[PDB]
Each structure stands twice: as structure tokens, then as C-alpha cells.
């Protein structure tokens, strides 16, 4: 059997997508460590030159950049110096110990350690050069660390940079570690679980108090995503419902639905000749539905998500159910249509009809709810005063820890509402009908007859829901803003009948391991969120600070939300991100990141003008000036500065492309200063500057009006260049029309360049502090509520 | 070729009056009247088909389309509906599975295709 | 079952609208676009756009669940999708069997039926 | 432009028109495209003109 | 010596769509008395749809603004404006279409578009202009010769 492969070319499509986490499945993120010390200067050897531009015998040691990659054009100096600031706050360490940096210095006199390797190198360069003076290697004979036991503190020798010692000293003295000990940890759990007696917290450790820790940065949201930002919300509300859903305890020894199922075909007195209403009764009665029914209640409380009630009018024990129902949750909980759709049924099949009243004919979009207006219309007290509550029951919202909180009435918390429930539901049972036919007032009955055998059972289970919900509660970070999402999260009443009718007298709570692993993703999800925020923010008000105004800031909200982790960017619109711009535009930017962008700026321009491969300008003078002698150079045709000078800006004539004054300025030789980050020709040539070279330099953006290749010309005339003599026989100092704006380098001075580095000599960091905490539970027989009774107590 | 014509002749009748699907065989029915318009390509492609009939071999099947093409009367359409059914009958179609295949994969995949388009769908 | 859209699945308890639902919004304001769509099992909308959708669809899904038995469930799903992605036919011919690259749809599998309604929509 | 399936996306989760439906009707975005917004660019500006 | 069909400034700087987005969130807040609550909240997230694109809006705006003023600057008949016989049919989506997709890149016609819609629009004119003489010089010679 011989085969024939036939292939075809099937093109790629490549859909745009992230990769989305769950909130459990978001890692912390990394904490930051140095292991070396910042640098942007090194000290680097060049030959010096006399006055007269012979060069010397011996060489100075100058500060160049490590790395000159400094473009071209203001424009481009401002973006490489916000990624500068990107890359040195993430070389920003989180905690420091110096004796990881420190090395041997191979010649202190003590064989001390110095930080970090590169100040060794540095050290020997000095030390072994031959033209290095005794002074200088005395000095790093003297050059050891000292140690402080008793303080915990440790100072090395490094030599720096200014700018370097700047930044490394920011970064030592502004360390985000602190102290770490067993109150700390006992303090770090939430404040209810600690006040709650049905839980017992232990520690087997003493924490050392060379411990330490980072504390999580847990403000509250900055950017009030719950307003506006629907979309956004309605993503972060569901991940918060399915974080929540795992959470909440299963219930345990529920009653068998076998036995429940018969003992409620005994109670209706189901008759199979018959077609009834009591049949669909027992209709989705099962385990499964109730601790669906149980996780949906409090996972959707805890997120304040939105729930929609998916019920079968023809079934009335559902509106017995949803009675229950809307008597324990606020209302609020719920789209207005669902709910009032649930209302209305109940209102129809069992309120109006057994007091007799004519079927209420309720307008979509009424202002009113169906029971608001049935408890104006309704004359029984006992109803009334329940479908008030209902109407009325809401969520209090309180700050407790700090966290904002959504509260429920202490009525439910206690299962006393139940009861009012129970007296309405039994004069409705004690009424009439009388425009019914007695077989409706029977089925009527027969529901309200199933929900109040478990009358106690319906306390106890109320008292548990509001017990697990604000047990949970406690573990939550973030505010539990009360806002009606996108979309919901669907209830069947089948599963709140389930619920009602199989809860047993067994508490379920939740497990310390649940409620800590629970916080521990809320703090994890909180920080990252606060972080990426301080981030986002830090670098928009950079870029705005560096007047980057070419720059499309889509990208910075795109990763911001892309680290966030639960949404999906490639989904996101423009518009949405560029409000998130906004919002982010009006937060004051974190302390550090703040306090390092301010040393950026202060320092930029000096780095910029440190880098060889760029000048800050050229003047174009028409009369002869004299080279200046410097040390490095020899004689060079350098300005320190542009006075004396008309200034055309670079980048500005980039921008608008208009060449008109330049043009001018060139054709009639007025002299001008062209400023603007530009590449320069280093000429070392005699000859070249006696031809009046760097004249010729100009014509060709009169002739292209471009400013892009304009590359003036560097003079360095000293002993190397090959026609010196002509300076060294004539007693000629050498003169030029054209100056390159550009700064000297700065001598590297040894001894200033020393600076004692103090960080702790050693300790110990720990990311998860609950690791150190084994909590257990009473026995759930005894698990009391905050009323100090038991949460269930039926027998 | 002679089931062609039929993809083209329920387009050709007016309603008077119709049937509405309620619930999977529940109809309620409309006095509705409904005129049936028609473009000249459509008839053109008609004109093709029919074309393609006679390029077969067909007399009969033609010609009575055309005569219900005077009128396009539901009343007479009982005979379109006939053609249509007993075009069915003259048995399948039991290609080699090469050729039926090669028929089916046969594909012209292109990069030139609308990105957007299959973005969204 | 009950989503209208779905002519082959719709049905509120077993039996689908045998007689379809075109006619109710037929009128002289309207008018009916119907498309012939058993060719499009090899077109290039059912390679991998068609099945990276519905990989898509179900990484979506995969976060709105905390059960290990429903992830895998699921992972099962779309690792069906991603091998039909890249999926090659066996045809007979005489003595040779050819081996064809199809990352198309056919029928023959589950999702078939659905899947293609979901497409066609 | 915006990416169409983003703004498509947006406006559909906003709008809901699917729920809003009757369930006997189809009701979605349409005319949402990067054609229809430089057809609308084109014909404004070139009414104004004219 | 051309007349010209110009915007309010308003709509030139785009800073009018500020008070749209001002009407806008104003409905949004609206408690649509008797209307029923799903079809209500589907409204007002659609006012919100528009009303949260206010950047990108009065960024559309200015460029619309910009463009017509730029290549009405190449317009060399006088802009009369006449409600015509048969007119441009609009699309509402297609307004949507350009209101929701419009991002922040800047289009302005290119000289050499510029440059070539004025030459056509000035080769028109002439061309009209010379034939309006050359009928009247023949129908004046005509009447004058007698050539009745």
C-alpha cells in the first residue's frame, strides 16, 4: 500500500487574545533584589594634552557613560530618558543587604571588602597604574567595610558617579521591607476572623527580630472602576463572583431528598388521576440545587453581582420560595425585571387572590414595584407589614478595617424576619379565597404548608447564609461597591426551593484555610492592582513631564490592563483606555517612583551632555575664534555656552518643516546657534581646519531643508594629528568660524568618588505571613453567630 | 439542470393570502397579499437555465416552464412542483469517492480576504 | 432547543418547525435573502477561524469554573478542536491511498450540526 | 480605527439588544464597519463641498 | 471674491460636542418615567456608548471641521446653496460607524490632492466660463447678422 500526501496551504488566522487568570490563579508578583549597584558614569583612561597641545606622559582618568547610545534629536533625548526612567524603576530593589555586592579589595591594607565588583575593578586600575599617585593608593589601602553588630548595620566603600551615588543611596535609605514578628503576623489576619470565637489561631515559631516583610499596598481603588466603567466592572465583578463561589463551605448532611420528596408527596396528597398544581411542587428538588442555590446567594453577595430569578409561574411553590427569597436578600440584588416579574406572580397567585382582590394589572416600567403597591392595597397587617419590609430591606453600607462593606439587616442576620415572613404566610393560609375555586385555596395551603414545616429549619438557614456572608466579608480588601452590573448571574427559585426544603440542622462554616486562602487572593489581586496603577501613572507623568508629545499613551493602558490579568484587551476599544488615561492622569504618582524620576530630571541634562556621540548644538559664527585648550582635546572649537548667540530650535524646525529663516540665515551668514541634539565629526586634521572645513557643512539643508544629516564638525587638534607642527613652528593658535556646543568631560577624582554604603548586615525576608499561622474551628454544633447563640439550632 | 428553474419560479408568484409557523406545526393564517418583484437578472438566469435544459436534450420540461411563465399562477404551479419532484427519480449519483471528494476539498484559500470581517465573525 | 435562530434545533418540546417561519414578516416592505450553504464544508471561514473561535469560546469558559472535572472536560473539547485544525482525509484510488489535507468541516462528527449553525450565524 | 471586534464587542455588552428581543425576532449591531465610518467621512465632507 | 459656506467656530475647535456630551450624560441620568426598565437601561448605555468617546469625538470633529475648510479653500465657484432635486442618501449607521471607530490619527488631504482638486475645479470653471462666451457670441452674432 503506497500512499500520496496532497498538502494545501491553509492560511494562518492569528485572533487577537490575551491570556486570562482567574484571581486564585494570579501569582504575586516577584520581590525585587539588587545584586549590583546602578551605574550610568564609568572611569575610563584618555591622554591629556599641554596648553600648547602636546601631549603629556601621563594620562587622567575621566566619568564617560557606560552606555553612550544617546541619540539624536531632543525629541528622541526625552524618549530615551523615559526609558531610562522605565529601566531604573525596575531596577529599583524592593530590599538590600550590601554584603551579597561586596568583594575583596585585593589591596586594603586590612584585605577588606569593598562593593560592589565593579569598585574593585575600578580599585585595581588605580592601584596597579603606574602614573596614579601615592596618595590615591594610600587611600585605597584605607578603603575596608565596618560592621556593626550590635546596630545590624554594615558600611562598605564604593566609588560612584554623583548621579550613581544618587540613585544607589535612594535605593538603600528607601527600602520597602520592614520589621516582622508574631504580632504582626496575628495583626496581618483580618480583624473579624481574630474577634470570631468560632475560630482558634495558634503559632509554633518565634520570629527572629532580624525578620522582615513587605506589606501590601491596599488602597482602596483610585481609578472608581464601578463608575463608568461598565465593561471593565462587569469583568472584574465576575471574576470576584467566581473567586467567591469557590469559598462558600458546601453544605454538608443535607436531609435525603428521598425522604423529603416523599414526606412532601404525603403532605400534598398528590393524586395520580388528577391533573394539579401541587405536582410541580417537587419539581427540581435536589442536593445539587441547594448548594447551588447556597453558592449563588453568597458568592453573588460578596461580589455584588447581580442576580436574575429564572422561575416557572405555573410552579407555586417557587413563589413560596421566592417569598423567602426576597425576604432574606435585599432587593437590590436583583434586575428590576426579574424581580418584579417574581413579585407580580406572587402578588396574583397568592396575596391578592386569597384576601379576594381583583387581579393587580401592573404596568411595565411602573415606577412602583408590584408589592410597593400591594402594601398600599393590602389590608392585613401581618402581610402588609412584610411586603413594607421587603420593599425596604436594603443593604447598609459600612466601613469596617477600613474596607467598605455591605451590611445586611441585623433582622436577617438573626433569622428574625423569618418569622414575620411566617406570620404573613399564615394569615394568608387563614383567608378565603372566596372568588376561587376551594382546590386553588388547597394548593395554595399545601405550598404555604410545605414551607412552614421548616419553619425552624428556614431560621436556621438564614442565620447561616448571613453568617457565612459576612465571615467571608471579612476577607475582602476591596470595596464592595452596590452598583446593578452588565449582566447577572441566573438563580433558579427550583434551587431556593431545594435549599428550603433539604437544609438539615448541620452548620457549615467557612475553613480558616478557606478564609486565609480566600484574603490572600483578594490582598494579591488588591496589590497587583495598586501597583500596576502607580506604574501606569509614574510613567504617564513622565512622558507629560518630558513634553513627549508625539507619544500615543494607548500602549501604557494596554499593558497596565493586560497585567492586570482578568481582562481581555483585544476587546477593549480606544476609548476606553484613553478614559482610563484620564483617570489615571489626575493620581498623584507613588513616593518612590516619584522621587526617581525627580533625581532623572535633575541629572538628564548632565548625562546627555556627558555622551560623546551627540552635541547640543552647533553655532555658526562668520569670524575667526580661537580653539579652546582643554586638557582632554587639546586645542578644540567647543562652546560652553550659546551666549552672544540667535538660537534656532532643532527640533521645532523638524516639526513645522519650515526652513524659510535657517535659509535665510545661511544665505546672508548671520550668525546663528542651531540647538538640537546632533551627531559631530571628530577631525583631528590640521589641514582640515586651515581649509575652513567646518564651514561647508550647512549648505545642504538650504539645498534639501533637512536638518537630519547636519553633522558639524569637531576640531581636535593636539600632538597626534599629523600636521601639528604647523601649530607647534608658527606659534598659532588655531581659529574657526564654527563652534560645536558641547560640554568637557569631568575629571574622575578618587577620593570624592568614595562613598560608604550603609545597609543591614542580614536578615531575613517572608512573603506569606498566614503560612505561620494554624487555625482550626469549634465543633459546628457550637458555632455561634453574632447574637452569641448557635447559628442553627433545630434538633 | 431540470431542478434549477425551481431555486428561481418561487419568486415569480404572488401571495394571496399564507401560512404563518406558530409553535412546530401550529398555523395561523394571513389574508396577506404579497406582489412578487422580480429584477431582469433574475429572469435572465431563468432564461439561462432553461437554456441549459435544451443544451441537454430537454423539450418537454422547458416548454412547460415557459407556458407557466405566461401567467406564474400558483393555481398552474402544481405542474412546476411535479417537474421539480420527478427530477429527483432518476436515480443517485454513485461517483468514485476520489472524484466526489476531490469535488467537495476543492478550495481556493486566499490572504486577501477581509481581516475584519473574520475578526468579528 | 429554544433559541429561534436555530431552524434545525428550535423546538419547544421535540418536533422542529416542519414548515419553517419564513412568511410571517413577508411583505411589500420586505424581502426574503436565502443562500444555498451545503457547499461550504472546505470554504475558508471553516478552517481556523471557524475553529479558534470556538477554542475561544471555550478559554473563556475555562475561568468561569472552579471544577477540575468541568476544566477538563473542556480542555478535552479544545484539544478535539485543535487536532481538526490541522486534520488530514484518507481517499482510496485503486491501489494508492491519497492522504489530503483538510483543516475544513465535515460531518461525521458531534459538534457538526451546531457547530455549522453557530458558523452560518 | 478602533479594532471593529472591540467596538463591536463594547457596544454589544452595553446594548444587550439580544435580550431585548422578542424571542421570535433576531436583533443585532449592524452597519458597525470601517467601510460604513469612511463612506460617512467621504460623504459629509463632500456634501459640504458640493 | 469666492463665496464660501464656513462653520461656526464652535464646530471648527470641535468644544460644541462638550455640550453634547453634556446633553448626552444629562439623558443618561434621566429617569425614563413609564418606559420599561431593560429597553431604558439599553438607551441609556447606548447614550453612554457616545457620550464616553467625547476625546475621540471632538478629535472627529475638528478633523471634519479641518478637512472641508482645507479643500474649501480649493473651490473656486461661489457655494450656493440650493435644496437640490434628488439628494445624498445617508446612512445613520454609517454615522455610528464613524463615530464609534474613529481613533486619533490625524488625515489631512495631501498637497498634491489639494493641488489637484483646485485645478480641476478651476479647469471646470473656465471651461464653463469660455463656452458661456462662445454660445453668446454666436447667438449675438446670429441675431446681429439677421439670421432669423
Known sequence: ?795 | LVSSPMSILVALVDINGTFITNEELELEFSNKYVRAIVPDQTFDELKQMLDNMRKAGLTDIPKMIQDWLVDCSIEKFPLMAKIYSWSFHVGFRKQKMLDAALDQLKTEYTEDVDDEMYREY | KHTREYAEFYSQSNQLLSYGDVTRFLSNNSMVLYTDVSQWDSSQHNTQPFRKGIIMGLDMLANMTNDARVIQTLNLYKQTQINLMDSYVQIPDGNVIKKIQYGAVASGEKQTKAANSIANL
Open chain 1, 1 to 795: 500500500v503506497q500512499y500520496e500526501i496532497l498538502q494545501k496551504t491553509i492560511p494562518t488566522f492569528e485572533p487577537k487574545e490575551s491570556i486570562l487568570k482567574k484571581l486564585e490563579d494570579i501569582k504575586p508578583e516577584q520581590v525585587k533584589k539588587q545584586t549590583k549597584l546602578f551605574r550610568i558614569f564609568e572611569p575610563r583612561q584618555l591622554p591629556v594634552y599641554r596648553a600648547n597641545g602636546e601631549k603629556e606622559l601621563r594620562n587622567r582618568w575621566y566619568w564617560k557613560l557606560k552606555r553612550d547610545t544617546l541619540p539624536d534629536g531632543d525629541y528622541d533625548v526625552r524618549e530615551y530618558f523615559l526609558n531610562l526612567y522605565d529601566q531604573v524603576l525596575t531596577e529599583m530593589p524592593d530590599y538590600l543587604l550590601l554584603k551579597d555586592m561586596a568583594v575583596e579589595n585585593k589591596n586594603s591594607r586590612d584585605a577588606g571588602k569593598v562593593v560592589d565588583s565593579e569598585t574593585a575593578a575600578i580599585c585595581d586600575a588605580i592601584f596597579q597604574d603606574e602614573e596614579t599617585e601615592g596618595v590615591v593608593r594610600r587611600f585605597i589601602a584605607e578603603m575596608r567595610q565596618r560592621v556593626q553588630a550590635d546596630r545590624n548595620v554594615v558600611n562598605y566603600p564604593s566609588i560612584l558617579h554623583p548621579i550613581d551615588h544618587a540613585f544607589n543611596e535612594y535605593f538603600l535609605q528607601h527600602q520597602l521591607v520592614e520589621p516582622l514578628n508574631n504580632d504582626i503576623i496575628f495583626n496581618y489576619i483580618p480583624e473579624r476572623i481574630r474577634n470570631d470565637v468560632n475560630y482558634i489561631l495558634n503559632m509554633d515559631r518565634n520570629l527572629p527580630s532580624t525578620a522582615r516583610y513587605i506589606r501590601p499596598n491596599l488602597l482602596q481603588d483610585r481609578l472608581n472602576l464601578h463608575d463608568n466603567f461598565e465593561s471593565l466592572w462587569d469583568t472584574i465583578t465576575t471574576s470576584n463572583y467566581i473567586l467567591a463561589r469557590s469559598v462558600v463551605p458546601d453544605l454538608k448532611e443535607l436531609v435525603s431528598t428521598e425522604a423529603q420528596i416523599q414526606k412532601m408527596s404525603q403532605d400534598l396528597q398528590l393524586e395520580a388521576l388528577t391533573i394539579q398544581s401541587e405536582t410541580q411542587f417537587l419539581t427540581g428538588i435536589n442536593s445539587q440545587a441547594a448548594n447551588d442555590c447556597f453558592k449563588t446567594l453568597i458568592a453573588a453577595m460578596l461580589s455584588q453581582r447581580t442576580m436574575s430569578l429564572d422561575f416557572v409561574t405555573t410552579n407555586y411553590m417557587s413563589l413560596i420560595s421566592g417569598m423567602w427569597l426576597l425576604t432574606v436578600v435585599p432587593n437590590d440584588m436583583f434586575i428590576r425585571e426579574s424581580l418584579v416579574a417574581c413579585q407580580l406572580a406572587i402578588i396574583n397567585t397568592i396575596i391578592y387572590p386569597a384576601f379576594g382582590m381583583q387581579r393587580m394589572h401592573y404596568r411595565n416600567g411602573d415606577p412602583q414595584t408590584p408589592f410597593q403597591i400591594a402594601e398600599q392595597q393590602i389590608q392585613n397587617f401581618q402581610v402588609a407589614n412584610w411586603l413594607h419590609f421587603v420593599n425596604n430591606n436594603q443593604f447598609r453600607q459600612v466601613v469596617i478595617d477600613g474596607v467598605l462593606n455591605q451590611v445586611l439587616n441585623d433582622n436577617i442576620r438573626n433569622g428574625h424576619v423569618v418569622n414575620q415572613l411566617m406570620e404573613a404566610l399564615m394569615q394568608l393560609s387563614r383567608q378565603q379565597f372566596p372568588t376561587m375555586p376551594v382546590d386553588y385555596k388547597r394548593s395554595i395551603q399545601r405550598g404555604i404548608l410545605l414551607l412552614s414545616n421548616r419553619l425552624g429549619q428556614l431560621v436556621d438557614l438564614t442565620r447561616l447564609l448571613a453568617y457565612n456572608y459576612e465571615t467571608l466579608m471579612a476577607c475582602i480588601t476591596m470595596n464592595m461597591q452596590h452598583v446593578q452590573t452588565l449582566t447577572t448571574e441566573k438563580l433558579q427559585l427550583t434551587s431556593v426551593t431545594s435549599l428550603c426544603m433539604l437544609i438539615g440542622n448541620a452548620t457549615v462554616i467557612p475553613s480558616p484555610q478557606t478564609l486565609f486562602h480566600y484574603y490572600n487572593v483578594n490582598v494579591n489581586f488588591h496589590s497587583n492592582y495598586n501597583e500596576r496603577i502607580n506604574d501606569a501613572v509614574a510613567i504617564i507623568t513622565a512622558a507629560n513631564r518630558l513634553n513627549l508629545y508625539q507619544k500615543k499613551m494607548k500602549s501604557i493602558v494596554e499593558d497596565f490592563l493586560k497585567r492586570l490579568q482578568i481582562f481581555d484587551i483585544s476587546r477593549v476599544p480606544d476609548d476606553q483606555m484613553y478614559r482610563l488615561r484620564d483617570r489615571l492622569r489626575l493620581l498623584p504618582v507613588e513616593i518612590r517612583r516619584l522621587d526617581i524620576f525627580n533625581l532623572i530630571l535633575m541629572n538628564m541634562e548632565q548625562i546627555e551632555r556627558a555622551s560623546d556621540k551627540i552635541a547640543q548644538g552647533v553655532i555658526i559664527a562668520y569670524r575667526d575664534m580661537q580653539l579652546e585648550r582643554d586638557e582632554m582635546y587639546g586645542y578644540v572649537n567647543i562652546a560652553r555656552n550659546l551666549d552672544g548667540f540667535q538660537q534656532i530650535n532643532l527640533e521645532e524646525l523638524m516639526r513645522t518643516g519650515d526652513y524659510a529663516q535657517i535659509t535665510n540665515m545661511l544665505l546672508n551668514n548671520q550668525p546663528v546657534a542651531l540647538v538640537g541634539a546632533l551627531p559631530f565629526i571628530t577631525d583631528s586634521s590640521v589641514i582640515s581646519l586651515v581649509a575652513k572645513l567646518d564651514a561647508t557643512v550647512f549648505a545642504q539643508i538650504v539645498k534639501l531643508r533637512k536638518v537630519d544629516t547636519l553633522k558639524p564638525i569637531l576640531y581636535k587638534i593636539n600632538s597626534d594629528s599629523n600636521d601639528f607642527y604647523l601649530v607647534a613652528n608658527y606659534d598659532w593658535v588655531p581659529t574657526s568660524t564654527t563652534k560645536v556646543y558641547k560640554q568637557i568631560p569631568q575629571q574622575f577624582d578618587f577620593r570624592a568618588s568614595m562613598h560608604m554604603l550603609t545597609s543591614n548586615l542580614t536578615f531575613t525576608v517572608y512573603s506569606d505571613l498566614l503560612a505561620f499561622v494554624s487555625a482550626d474551628t469549634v465543633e459546628p454544633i457550637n458555632a455561634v453567630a453574632f447574637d452569641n447563640m448557635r447559628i442553627m439550632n433545630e434538633l
